[PDB]
Design a protein around this motif. Structure first.
Motif, PDB file in Angstrom:
ATOM      1  N   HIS A   1      28.525  40.466  31.990  1.00  0.00           N
ATOM      2  CA  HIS A   1      29.366  40.748  32.349  1.00  0.00           C
ATOM      3  C   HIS A   1      30.118  39.521  31.747  1.00  0.00           C
ATOM      4  O   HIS A   1      30.187  39.060  31.076  1.00  0.00           O
ATOM      5  CB  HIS A   1      30.097  40.452  33.424  1.00  0.00           C
ATOM      6  CG  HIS A   1      29.482  42.425  34.196  1.00  0.00           C
ATOM      7  ND1 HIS A   1      27.754  42.120  34.667  1.00  0.00           N
ATOM      8  CD2 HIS A   1      28.903  43.390  34.194  1.00  0.00           C
ATOM      9  CE1 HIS A   1      27.085  43.048  35.598  1.00  0.00           C
ATOM     10  NE2 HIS A   1      28.503  44.405  34.652  1.00  0.00           N
TER      11      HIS A   1
ATOM     12  N   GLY B   1      23.600  43.941  29.546  1.00  0.00           N
ATOM     13  CA  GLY B   1      23.631  44.077  30.811  1.00  0.00           C
ATOM     14  C   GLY B   1      24.437  43.176  31.953  1.00  0.00           C
ATOM     15  O   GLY B   1      24.286  42.919  33.256  1.00  0.00           O
TER      16      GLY B   1
ATOM     17  N   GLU C   1      31.346  45.374  29.732  1.00  0.00           N
ATOM     18  CA  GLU C   1      29.955  45.067  30.319  1.00  0.00           C
ATOM     19  C   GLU C   1      29.288  45.213  28.613  1.00  0.00           C
ATOM     20  O   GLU C   1      29.677  45.748  28.424  1.00  0.00           O
ATOM     21  CB  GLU C   1      28.956  45.748  31.230  1.00  0.00           C
ATOM     22  CG  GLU C   1      27.790  46.479  31.174  1.00  0.00           C
ATOM     23  CD  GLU C   1      27.103  46.813  31.991  1.00  0.00           C
ATOM     24  OE1 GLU C   1      27.809  46.803  33.398  1.00  0.00           O
ATOM     25  OE2 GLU C   1      26.074  47.444  32.283  1.00  0.00           O
TER      26      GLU C   1
ATOM     27  N   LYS D   1      26.319  37.618  34.815  1.00  0.00           N
ATOM     28  CA  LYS D   1      25.955  37.958  35.744  1.00  0.00           C
ATOM     29  C   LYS D   1      25.780  38.773  36.531  1.00  0.00           C
ATOM     30  O   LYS D   1      25.609  37.890  38.043  1.00  0.00           O
ATOM     31  CB  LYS D   1      23.898  37.286  35.717  1.00  0.00           C
ATOM     32  CG  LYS D   1      23.143  36.757  34.630  1.00  0.00           C
ATOM     33  N   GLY D   2      26.631  39.853  36.592  1.00  0.00           N
ATOM     34  CA  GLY D   2      28.003  39.959  37.831  1.00  0.00           C
ATOM     35  C   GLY D   2      26.549  41.651  38.354  1.00  0.00           C
ATOM     36  O   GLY D   2      26.114  42.472  38.028  1.00  0.00           O
ATOM     37  N   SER D   3      27.746  42.593  39.356  1.00  0.00           N
ATOM     38  CA  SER D   3      27.393  43.416  39.733  1.00  0.00           C
ATOM     39  C   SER D   3      28.658  44.589  39.414  1.00  0.00           C
ATOM     40  O   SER D   3      29.827  44.018  40.531  1.00  0.00           O
ATOM     41  CB  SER D   3      27.579  43.684  41.037  1.00  0.00           C
ATOM     42  OG  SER D   3      26.682  44.666  41.468  1.00  0.00           O
ATOM     43  N   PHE D   4      28.993  45.265  38.241  1.00  0.00           N
ATOM     44  CA  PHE D   4      30.058  45.963  37.901  1.00  0.00           C
ATOM     45  C   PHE D   4      30.031  46.682  37.831  1.00  0.00           C
ATOM     46  O   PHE D   4      29.131  47.938  37.261  1.00  0.00           O
ATOM     47  CB  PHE D   4      30.921  44.865  37.000  1.00  0.00           C
ATOM     48  CG  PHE D   4      31.734  43.716  37.493  1.00  0.00           C
ATOM     49  CD1 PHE D   4      32.375  43.992  38.285  1.00  0.00           C
ATOM     50  CD2 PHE D   4      30.439  42.753  36.452  1.00  0.00           C
ATOM     51  CE1 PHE D   4      32.907  42.432  38.512  1.00  0.00           C
ATOM     52  CE2 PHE D   4      31.094  41.678  37.206  1.00  0.00           C
ATOM     53  CZ  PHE D   4      32.330  41.505  38.016  1.00  0.00           C
TER      54      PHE D   4
END
Ligand SMILES: *[C@H](O)[C@H](C[C@@H]1CCNC1=O)NC(=O)[C@H](CC(C)C)NC(=O)OCc1ccccc1
Ligand SMILES: *[C@H](O)[C@H](C[C@@H]1CCNC1=O)NC(=O)[C@H](CC(C)C)NC(=O)OCc1ccccc1
Lengths: 301, 301
Positions: free
Chosen positions: B172, B170, B166, B137-140
């Motif tokens: 990754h 949602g 992704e 659970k990233g932010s990309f």
């Protein structure tokens, strides 16, 4: 997509961390150019911290009383002064890794990254918000003083915080880089009470927009509200009043999502009166307030 | 005191980030010695990504089709090879900032720091766990491929993740630095989906221990439980079975708090069965499973 509490890359700040030892007190210091900045209470002894007279303790010290270690390289202290609650140690070497930097005093509600250090070596990096009561909810052990909080803009590090103490409730306190405490605290080892804290409303709203941008829409509604009728509810739940300046700052996020700021306020009002009823928003069962509108934009698109 | 999701200081990895361009695809690469590692889908165009044969696409490339920038300095590509889903680009300059490093493949439930990067420039840093379903659970955003996940041990940067894509939910997906995906995913723009996830029990327990270390005990109880008896409640709440090896790893935390593992398990059992009744643990209204036992010991000491 995705939304995480994200710190600034810490390289530029790591290259500035040094160890400062005075007597048997060791904390961290910030080596920028030929100056090392550290909390002034490094000069105090165990019994001196109870209620120190710093101008007295400092006049009784000379350069050779401050051991500054840069990794293995011991730096020579060739000067010193006191600016409010920080010590400034003039040293013989200018820090070659010194980045473009500024010293800034951040406002309550703004966020920053913290590089936790011990004995001059980084341990880890995390995000904090300056709480409305001028405390921060950090992670700080013995030896962590002198750790800094910072933001990066372009290639410029804006230093905004230096760590000095933990309050009895477990939250943390410190100064800007000119030595002035955030909040009504002093650097004496005595119990001190933070003011009653409150929730940073504009940050909660930004985070709700981050959630919509990421596909969390269950909390939206068709109702709307007035700014006055909204602040009446926020007051009850100990939320900061929401001003038109806050409404204006959420403009971009309102435009990106097509949800009017006061419509989102109606959502927040509902969430406050009824809780979430077993659902979550971006992985929290609580309303998150440590994301500024800027933090939301930087990470969404 | 205090407990935060804390990333490793990222300076040693910032020095390894570069920009890699092929055609009109740009992503990040990892420069170690005279080799630049990046996702192979950088050799794909718009149409290529739907159904590419990478061997067939790569044979058609020349060294000069690869533009690599380290800051302002262009780096000349003098060789290239494909290893699984990763591209190894030999360059005419060994990275002078190359740190001690290794490539390792991490296990489900372990954590690492991610240095989110765009156009070769570090953007932010945060902590991730490798979920049991091999996603993170990233932010990309677009442009982030080639960003790496890593841990640090003394002087050694252990690279364990490279970002590739992704998924529809949602979360990754990516590979180790040998280019082998974590999970049953492929680097092509087709429909694929993460398997069903579960909660990392051992980590939830590690975090309950952090909560006690930091002065909080409201969730403890006088009851106890057998491993099998605990795991029966776990299965019902979509928690991974707890093994004796997990219990052994939780030993040192058990010792520092004086709370037997199986006693903390009965606490967890009661927490799962009753919920939290409006209370929080370390500031969360959910049971947090993205701290390993090592993460807790490292931060709390
Ligand atoms: C500086 O290294 C240190 C940081 C504290 C200690 C544990 N966590 C922190 O953030 N500062 C002090 O010990 C500080 C010095 C005074 C002259 C202000 N005083 C302080 O924080 O005292 C309260 C306290 C000490 C130790 C544990 C818990 C609370
Ligand atoms: C590489 O820079 C990029 C990272 C994605 C973009 C959004 N978030 C990420 O983690 N990877 C891709 O675009 C990837 C390319 C394949 C041929 C390997 N496909 C992908 O992630 O498709 C789904 C998607 C693309 C764009 C936006 C949202 C989802």
């Amino acid at each position: 997509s995705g939304f995480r509490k994200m710190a600034f890359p810490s390289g530029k700040v790591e290259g500035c961390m040094v160890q400062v030892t005075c007597g048997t007190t060791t904390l961290n210091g910030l080596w920028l150019d030929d100056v090392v900045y550290c909390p002034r209470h490094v000069i105090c002894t165990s019994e001196d911290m109870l209620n120190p007279n710093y101008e007295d303790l400092l006049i009784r010290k000379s350069n050779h009383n401050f051991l500054v270690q840069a990794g293995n390289v011991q730096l020579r202290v060739i000067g010193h002064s006191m600016q409010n609650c920080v010590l400034k140690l003039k040293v013989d070497t200018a820090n070659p890794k010194t980045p473009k930097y500024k010293f800034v005093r951040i406002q309550p509600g703004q966020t920053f990254s913290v590089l936790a250090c011990y004995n001059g070596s980084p341990s880890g990096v995390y995000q904090c918000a300056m709480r409305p009561n001028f405390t921060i909810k950090g992670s700080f052990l013995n030896g962590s003083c002198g750790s800094v909080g910072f933001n990066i803009d372009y290639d410029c590090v804006s230093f905004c915080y230096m760590h000095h103490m933990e309050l009895p409730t477990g939250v943390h306190a410190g100064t800007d880089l000119e030595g002035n405490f955030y909040g009504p605290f002093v650097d004496r080892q005595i119990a001190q009470a933070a003011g009653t804290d409150t929730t940073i409303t504009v940050n909660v709203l930004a985070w709700l927009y981050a959630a919509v941008i990421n596909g969390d829409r269950w909390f939206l509604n068709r109702f709307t509200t007035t700014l006055n009728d909204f602040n009446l509810v926020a007051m009850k739940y100990n939320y900061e009043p929401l001003t038109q300046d806050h409404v204006d700052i959420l403009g971009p996020l309102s435009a990106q999502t097509g949800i009017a700021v006061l419509d989102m306020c109606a959502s927040l009002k509902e969430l406050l009166q009824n809780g979430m009823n077993g659902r979550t928003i971006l992985g929290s069962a609580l309303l998150e307030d440590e994301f500024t509108p800027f933090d939301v934009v930087r990470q969404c698109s």
